[PDB]
Amino acid sequence: DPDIFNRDPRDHYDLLQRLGYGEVFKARDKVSGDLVALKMVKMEPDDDVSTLQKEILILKTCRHANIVAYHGSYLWLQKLWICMEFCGAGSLQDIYQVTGSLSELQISYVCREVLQGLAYLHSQKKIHRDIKGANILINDAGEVRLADFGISAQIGATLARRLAFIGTPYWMAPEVAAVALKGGYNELCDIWSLGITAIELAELQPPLFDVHPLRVLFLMTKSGYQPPRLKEKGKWSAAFHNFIKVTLTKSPKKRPSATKMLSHQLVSQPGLNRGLILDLLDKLKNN
Amino acid sequence: VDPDIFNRDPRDHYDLLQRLGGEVFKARDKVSGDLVALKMVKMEPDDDVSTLQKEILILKTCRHANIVAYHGSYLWLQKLWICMEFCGAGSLQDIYQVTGSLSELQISYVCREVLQGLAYLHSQKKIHRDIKGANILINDAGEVRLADFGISAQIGATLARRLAFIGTPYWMAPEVAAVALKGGYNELCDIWSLGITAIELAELQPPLFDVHPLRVLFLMTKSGYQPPRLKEKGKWSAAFHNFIKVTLTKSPKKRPSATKMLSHQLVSQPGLNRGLILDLLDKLKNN
Incomplete structure (x- = not known):
């Protein structure tokens, strides 16, 4: 499971600060209180996030301290959000x-x-x-x-x-x-x-x-x-x-x-x- | 062989006739009356036309009826014009x-x-x-x-x-x-x-x-x-x-x-x- 979720990432995270394709945000997990980085990219009508499943899985299965951690992806109102270690x-x-x-x-x-x-x-x-x-x-x-x-x-x-x-x-x-x-x-x-x-x-x-x-x-x-x-x-x-x-x-x-x-x-x-x-x-x- | 990129206004040689859809123009040689196509591309300050010499030479040296003929290139006021068969x-x-x-x-x-x-x-x-x-x-x-x-x-x-x-x-x-x-x-x-x-x-x-x-x-x-x-x-x-x-x-x-x-x-x-x-x-x- 690449865990690309079809829901509003704001269900789980509070956006805090724009850090500056798309945009990068510092955000805080609503339950754990963890800081995360949220990378947003606009989707066009001809876009298909399912074509990204391979690269996403490549990142997800990494289990090493020196590789940025992957927490999941969100597709919502034609924005793709990639949640990673802050x-x-x-x-x-x-x-x-x-x-x-x-x-x-x-x-x-x-x-x-x-x-x-x-x-x-x-x-x-x-x-x-x-x-x-x-x-x-x-x-x-x-x-x-x-x-x-x-x-x-x-x-x-x-x-x-x-x-x-x-x-x-x-x-x-x-x-x-x-x-x-x-x-x-x-x-x-x-x-x-x-x-x-x-x-x-x-x-x-x-x-x-x-x-x-x-x-x-x-x-x-x-x-x-x-x-x-x-x-x-x-x-x-x-x-x-x-x-x-x-x-x-x-x-x-x-x-x-x-x-x-x-x-x-x-x-x-x-x-x-x-x-x-x-x-x-x-x-x-x-x- | 020389790629013949001229540092001259291409209009020193050609009358533009109409826009065909950078830009492509139907044009006529002022001297011979030959019709030609002039392809125009905007240059950025970053740009160096000399890096295009290899590809230009590849086209220039073609001598066959079924390959579009190349007549020359012009660099002028930050526009590159490529002159080809019409x-x-x-x-x-x-x-x-x-x-x-x-x-x-x-x-x-x-x-x-x-x-x-x-x-x-x-x-x-x-x-x-x-x-x-x-x-x-x-x-x-x-x-x-x-x-x-x-x-x-x-x-x-x-x-x-x-x-x-x-x-x-x-x-x-x-x-x-x-x-x-x-x-x-x-x-x-x-x-x-x-x-x-x-x-x-x-x-x-x-x-x-x-x-x-x-x-x-x-x-x-x-x-x-x-x-x-x-x-x-x-x-x-x-x-x-x-x-x-x-x-x-x-x-x-x-x-x-x-x-x-x-x-x-x-x-x-x-x-x-x-x-x-x-x-x-x-x-x-x-x-």
């Missing part, structure tokens, strides 16, 4: 846009926590598919949670199809259809993405961010494409430089797994705990 | 929405002409990628021209990225970026699309048109997916039914090539010529 500090992107770059320690802790999440997903034959700062959520306890990509991706595609930015599948051969579902994704792509995310946390944007997307696609698919590096060498330890080097391995056959990466000096070092992020949150609040 | 009757979709379904002969002629275009493209190691009624253009002489997909595809993707309906590639592993560029297209996918198109011309919609796109993606990628068929059996010859059967072959390893298809009874029959479409154009105007 992470009061927002995404790391939300945070660094005000605090500035993270320390090496803070990044190291974040990477360890993401890797625990990733090792879990990959053990369940799942792939995150979109590791980046905007998808790493932080709660007020300084704990780190991976946000879901799968549901949002399908909603995004439907919008793009509606506006004819991308094609519809009716004329597509099955090989083409398959790729349009599969994508380029293999589990090890998450490792590369984490590597890019570490740079992003260190530098406030991924490599080539100021370059046109189609141009970057052309560049990154060249043979002899040079994997990105941290810009300021002296600022970062040899271990951090090495973490970047190994996660950003071009050949997926040679790119290390999540569990292998949990063995790396950078994320296995003692001292890494949530207090490092509690520091970041204080800086967020009080500068 | 096809006065519009697309077959434009046409059948008024006339109703095409006759088997008319379809047979269109398929033969599309197949000549595809054979040419494939021999040049190009793939059309979007065969459908809307991309098959008809001139006043009843001749058949394949419209370009590649340039429009890139513009569409850029818009989708801008609105975050789809993601950017900055965090993608090279495997993932590569697939996003290759998209699962292979030359034989055009053959499948043509089969769907023949049904579309016969029935005014492709198979499953009333079904949600994501659901059709899921259905069309099962191992036991049943390829579509013509709905009305008695209306169509055994030859047409067989044409559908063989073009809609699931495994690309067994699907017939364009030139193999040109040997098929349906399109190799004597009597196929532009007069069949001249009839359709008379029906469009008068009946």
